[PDB]
Design a binder for this molecule. Structure first.
Ligand code: HEM
Ligand code: XE
Ligand code: XE
Length: 110
């Protein structure tokens, strides 16, 4: 088992450090980066990202559905290219396989 939860945590750290304004689109808006793990709303969003990763690896992930749902938050290609940079970093830091291919499936719909 890859510690996906831990990777998701680093990933969120990377993403919000580089694009802090992204964080305003969540229910943990305005919460200090170093406090995220103590915030209920974050805890739920992180679990869901981990779920998706496990579904992408599992073969059950609906990439088109996730893309439409991000479109529904005015989150598009540019954001998911940025996230690809951030996940690459967070995976590499954990010796975990990269999620470039899964992130690519999402991009193919954005
Ligand atoms: C690898 C990249 C990402 C993955 C795997 C991912 C995963 C998810 C998942 C699984 C959900 C819940 C889907 C649902 O049931 O509606 C979600 C919601 C969301 N995503 Fe992403 N995320 C990604 C990147 C981003 C980025 C770059 C942004 C830009 C801000 C973003 C913004 C949001 C927002 C605002 C929500 C809903 C928040 C809420 O309901 O409170 N995501 N994401
Ligand atoms: Xe991710
Ligand atoms: Xe992913």
């Amino acid at each position: 088992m890859v510690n996906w939860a831990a990777v998701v945590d680093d990933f969120y750290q990377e993403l919000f450090k580089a694009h802090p304004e992204y964080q305003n689109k969540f229910g943990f808006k305005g919460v200090a980066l170093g406090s995220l793990k103590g915030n209920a709303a974050y805890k739920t969003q992180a679990g869901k990202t981990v779920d998706y990763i496990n579904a992408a690896i599992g073969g059950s992930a609906d990439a088109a559905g996730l893309a439409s749902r991000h479109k529904g938050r005015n989150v598009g290609s540019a954001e998911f290219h940025n996230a690809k940079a951030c996940a690459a970093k967070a995976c590499s830091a954990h010796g975990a396989p990269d999620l470039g291919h899964a992130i690519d499936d999402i991009l193919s719909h954005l």
